[PDB]
Structure formats: structure tokens, C-alpha cells
């Protein structure tokens, strides 16, 4: 097998984890 | 289960089950859930290195991606940072050592070069 490559298109998705970060969000 | 199904296998799953972990994490609001569905993709991450190991560019980002955790506050995120990390570096110790494809210096010297930045808000024990 050759395996060009795919698994790099995977780790752009990777980049959009939030969790804390700043978030200047509220009621 | 990791290791009970064949390589090919293992990879169509975990790119199944980590894509919507990923997706189920920008969808659940409130740092403690993002936490804990965090948590979780880290530690299935760390469970199979062999995956790891096949895919630099994925590795690469998993790692990265850790040391950005390593300046979370959220309470126990930063300890599973730390854990995943040393897990990793142990499973694919050769792949941070050796030049991999698409770079031009192995990436343990980018690591070497910033441990400060890295480490800056980690409590000694996870120094």
C-alpha cells in the first residue's frame, strides 16, 4: 500500500474544543 | 478493548468515535461538561497508541493539544493532561525523537525549547 495521506484533514477538526478559554458570554 | 480488533478496524472506529465525541464536545455548553467529555476522548486516546503511532500529523496534534490543557483551570483537566501526556510519551517515545514526515527537527526539541511556557501553570506534582 502507498498511504498518501487523510488522516491530516482529521486534525483540523480536532482545533474546534472549547471548554474555558475566555467566554465573555451571559445572561 | 483496545487491541482486540485488527488494526484497520481499530482505525475506521476510533475515527468514528472521537469525530462525534469531538462534535458532542462544541455541543454540550458549560465548562463541566466540556470537561468531562475532554477528559474522555484523552483518555481513549491514550489507550491506543498503535493508532497514535501510524499517524504523526494526528499524534502531533493530540500532543500540542494536551499542552494547551496543561493551562486549564477547570479542576481535573489539567491533571488528565498530565496523565495522557506520560502515557503517550511512553507508548511513542521514538516518534518524538526521530524527524517524521512533513518536519524538518524532531519534536521533542520544540518541546525542549518551551517547557517553561508548557509547564508555567502545572502544580509540582504534575511538573
Redesign the interface.
Given at each position: 500500500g502507498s498511504a498518501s495521506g487523510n488522516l491530516n484533514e482529521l486534525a483540523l477538526k480536532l482545533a474546534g474544543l472549547d471548554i474555558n478559554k475566555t467566554e465573555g458570554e451571559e445572561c | 478493548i483496545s487491541g482486540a480488533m485488527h488494526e484497520e478496524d481499530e482505525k475506521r472506529f476510533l475515527?468514528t468515535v472521537i469525530?462525534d465525541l469531538?462534535g458532542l464536545?462544541?455541543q454540550k455548553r458549560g465548562?463541566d461538561n466540556?470537561?468531562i467529555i475532554?477528559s474522555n476522548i484523552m483518555y481513549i486516546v491514550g489507550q491506543y497508541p498503535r493508532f497514535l503511532r501510524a499517524?504523526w500529523?494526528?499524534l502531533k496534534?493530540?500532543v500540542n493539544?494536551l499542552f494547551e490543557?496543561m493551562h486549564?483551570?477547570?479542576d481535573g483537566?489539567q491533571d488528565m493532561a498530565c496523565d495522557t501526556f506520560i502515557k503517550i510519551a511512553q507508548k511513542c517515545r521514538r516518534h518524538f525523537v526521530q524527524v517524521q514526515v512533513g518536519e524538518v527537527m524532531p519534536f521533542i526539541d520544540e518541546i525542549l525549547n518551551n517547557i517553561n511556557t508548557i509547564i508555567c501553570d502545572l502544580q509540582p506534582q504534575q511538573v
Open positions: - | 475515527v469525530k469531538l464536545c462544541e465548562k466540556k470537561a475532554a499517524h500529523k494526528f496534534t493530540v493539544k490543557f486549564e483551570t477547570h483537566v
